[PDB]
């Protein structure tokens, strides 16, 4: 549904304007969750091959955690860039066309009528 936005620079995972955003920290909770997913994948790999789960393949578990945290960081960067594009386009089209978005006069409660239905 953004078929006309990325067409000027196709096949770009992370464009240049994505560097204008604040990058996510290394202590992001989603990033730590993806690292936990990598640790769980290492545990499952140790369990399905009939190995000691918490001892064997420590380098394997570290590689799993590292690869998962790397791909999670890059995917989080792409997600943040996409949502920045989304709300930037929202605000831009709202600003460009204020005839279809009139300013509603928010009336107070002193004169508006709310129907009351008693409970008994």
């Amino acid at each position: 549904m953004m078929t006309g936005r990325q067409a000027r620079a196709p096949l770009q995972f992370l464009p240049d304007e994505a560097r204008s955003l604040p990058p996510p920290k290394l202590t992001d909770p989603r990033l730590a969750y993806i690292g936990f997913l990598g640790y769980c994948s290492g545990l499952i790999d140790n369990a399905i091959r009939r190995r000691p789960v918490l001892s064997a393949g420590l380098h394997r578990q570290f590689l799993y955690i590292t690869s998962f945290v790397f791909v999670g960081y890059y995917l989080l960067k792409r997600q943040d860039y996409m949502y920045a594009v989304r709300d930037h386009d929202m605000f831009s089209y709202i600003k460009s066309h204020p005839e279809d978005f009139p300013e509603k006069d928010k009336k107070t409660y002193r004169e508006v009528f709310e129907e009351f239905h008693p409970v008994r």
Binding site: K107, Y109, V112, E114, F116, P118, V119, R120
Partner: protein, 171 residues
């Protein structure tokens, strides 16, 4: 102690006991034995506890709330001030329930205190109770289990509209 105006009590009138028989009443000796055996040690214990209290005194205060514009001076779907109005309305609801509790306690105390003359000596208490429950029913009744300040405002507007058609149909 309590404030005398919020919980009034008429002054007591205890008769003098006039003896007419030669048999001594044992209740006077029972009260004297009770005061000799029970009143003095309990009073001494309470005096010691009061001394221990007066050694170390500290204060606690009653919380107060200032006035915010109510639900009728709030824009619709504007949360940051109408939330305060709803908050104050719920606090007023709790205080008003306590006021009704005070009036009920006054009525029951009047009835028990006057005893067999409750039909004549507690007209004021029953009149004030009837007034306060009529106003309470006109304010908070039939709101429902999910009551809010908007519902009470709508009920008040409906009541004033009924009053307006009442004076229009009477003129």
């Amino acid at each position: 102690s309590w404030d005398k105006d919020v919980y009034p009590e008429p002054p007591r009138r205890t008769p003098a006991p006039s003896p007419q028989t030669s048999l001594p009443n044992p209740i006077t000796y029972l009260t004297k034995a009770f005061d000799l055996l029970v009143d003095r040690p309990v009073t001494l214990v309470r005096e010691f506890i009061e001394r221990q209290h007066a050694k170390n005194k500290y204060y606690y205060y009653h919380r107060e709330f200032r006035r915010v514009p109510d639900i009728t001076e709030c824009h619709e779907k504007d949360v940051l001030c109408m939330f305060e109005a709803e908050m104050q309305w719920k606090r007023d609801y709790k205080v008003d329930q306590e006021i009704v509790n005070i009036i009920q306690e006054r009525l029951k105390a009047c009835q028990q205190r006057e005893g067999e003359s409750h039909r004549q000596n507690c007209a004021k208490e029953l009149q004030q109770f009837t007034q306060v429950v009529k106003a309470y029913q006109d304010r908070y009744h039939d709101l429902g289990a999910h009551y809010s300040a908007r519902k009470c405002l709508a009920k008040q507007k409906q009541r004033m509209l009924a009053e307006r058609k009442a004076t229009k149909e009477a003129a």
